[PDB]
Amino acid sequence: PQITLWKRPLVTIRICGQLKEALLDTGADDTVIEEMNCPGKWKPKMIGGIGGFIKVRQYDQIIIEIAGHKAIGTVLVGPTPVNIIGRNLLTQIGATLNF
């Protein structure tokens, strides 16, 4: 599909058996998902943005379906205000920026 940018580019995702809305985010290196009590091994990470850093849990090889497109990779879980699909999974679903 083609997504214009008049509004936030939000899509439905499925992760850890849950449906969520998430932002397709070309400005995020990594994918960050709002706090959820998920299983699996993880490593502590800190990620920085506008305002400073938040502490997150890094899970590897997490399967996510993004707008019907399957992806598998690193998902960071923590107190983000919005669910963010970053470049690590955008590349896997064939997403480009065009102008």
Catalytic residues: 25
75-94: which residues touch a copy of itself (CB under 8 A)? 80-82, 84, 87, 90-91, 93-94
Among 1, 17, 27, 44, binds ligand 017 (CB under 6 A): 27
Alpha-carbon gap, residue 26 to 56, rounded angstroms: 20
Give, in degrees to the nearest 5, the angle at Cα 88 between 71 and 2: 70
User: Which one of 14-22, 35-43, 64-72, 82-90 is the stretch in contact with ligand 017 (CB under 6 A)?
Assistant: 82-90
In the bound state with a copy of itself, the residue whose beta carbon lies nearer, of 27 and 39, is 27
In the bound state with a copy of itself, the residue whose beta carbon lies nearer, of 17 and 52, is 52
Task: Name residue 56's beta-bridge partners.
Answer: 45
Phi-psi label, residue 20: left if phi above 0, alpha if psi -120 to 50, beta otherwise = beta
How large is the greatest C-alpha to C-alpha distance in the chain, in angstroms?
41
45-64: which residues touch ligand 017 (CB under 6 A)? 47, 49-50
Under DSSP, is residue 26 helix (H, G, I), strand (E, B) or coil? coil
Under DSSP, is residue 90 helix (H, G, I), strand (E, B) or coil? helix
**Which spans of this chain sit near ligand 017 (rule: CB under 6 A)?**
23, 25, 27-30, 32, 47, 49-50, 81-82, 84, 86
